[PDB]
């Protein structure tokens, strides 16, 4: 949404002017981050942790 603005001074019986809310956007992309590792069955078994 656009910032807060101000009302304007107006004559009595005069038509009120339009200062409606106006919008823009922020675009996201989303990059895939990845990490991996591999362990043999033998290593998985024998490790003390």
Partner 1 sequence: ASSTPQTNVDSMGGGHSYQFNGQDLTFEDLRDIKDVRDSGGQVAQLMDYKALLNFGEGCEIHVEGDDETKQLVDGEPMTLSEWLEDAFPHLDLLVLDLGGDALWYPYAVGEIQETITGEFKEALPAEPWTLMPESDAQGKVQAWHQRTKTHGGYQTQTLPADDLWHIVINKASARDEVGISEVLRNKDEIQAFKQNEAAINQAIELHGFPQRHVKVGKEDGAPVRDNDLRRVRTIFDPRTTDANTAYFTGQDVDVETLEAHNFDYSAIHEMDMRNLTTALGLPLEAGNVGADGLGSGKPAELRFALLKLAIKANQRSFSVQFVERVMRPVVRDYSPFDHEADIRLEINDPLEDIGEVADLIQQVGDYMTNEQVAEKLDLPAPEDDEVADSYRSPADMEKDEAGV
Partner 2 sequence: MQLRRSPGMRPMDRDWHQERARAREQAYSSDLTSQFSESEIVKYELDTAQIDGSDNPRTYIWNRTIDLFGMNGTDVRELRNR
Tell me the binding residues: 5-6, 15, 19, 35
Tokens matching residue 2: 């656009």
Answer for the pair 42, 20: CB distance below 8 angstroms, yes or no. Answer: no
Binding partner selected for residue 23 from partner 2, partner 1, Mg ion, none, CB under the kind-specific 5 to 8 Å limit: partner 2
Distance (Å, rounded) from C-alpha 43 to C-alpha 11? 85
Binding partner selected for residue 17 from partner 2, Mg ion, partner 1, none, CB under the kind-specific 5 to 8 Å limit: none
Rg (CA), the chain: 31
C-beta of 18 vs 41, nearer to partner 1 = 41
Sites of contact with partner 2 (CB under 8 A): 2, 18, 20, 22-25, 27, 29, 36
């Amino acid at each position: 949404a656009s910032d807060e603005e101000f009302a304007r001074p107006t004559g009595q019986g005069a038509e009120i002017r339009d200062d409606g809310e106006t919008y823009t956007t922020v675009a996201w992309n989303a990059t895939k981050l990845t990490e991996g590792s591999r362990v043999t069955d033998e290593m998985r078994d024998q490790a003390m942790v």
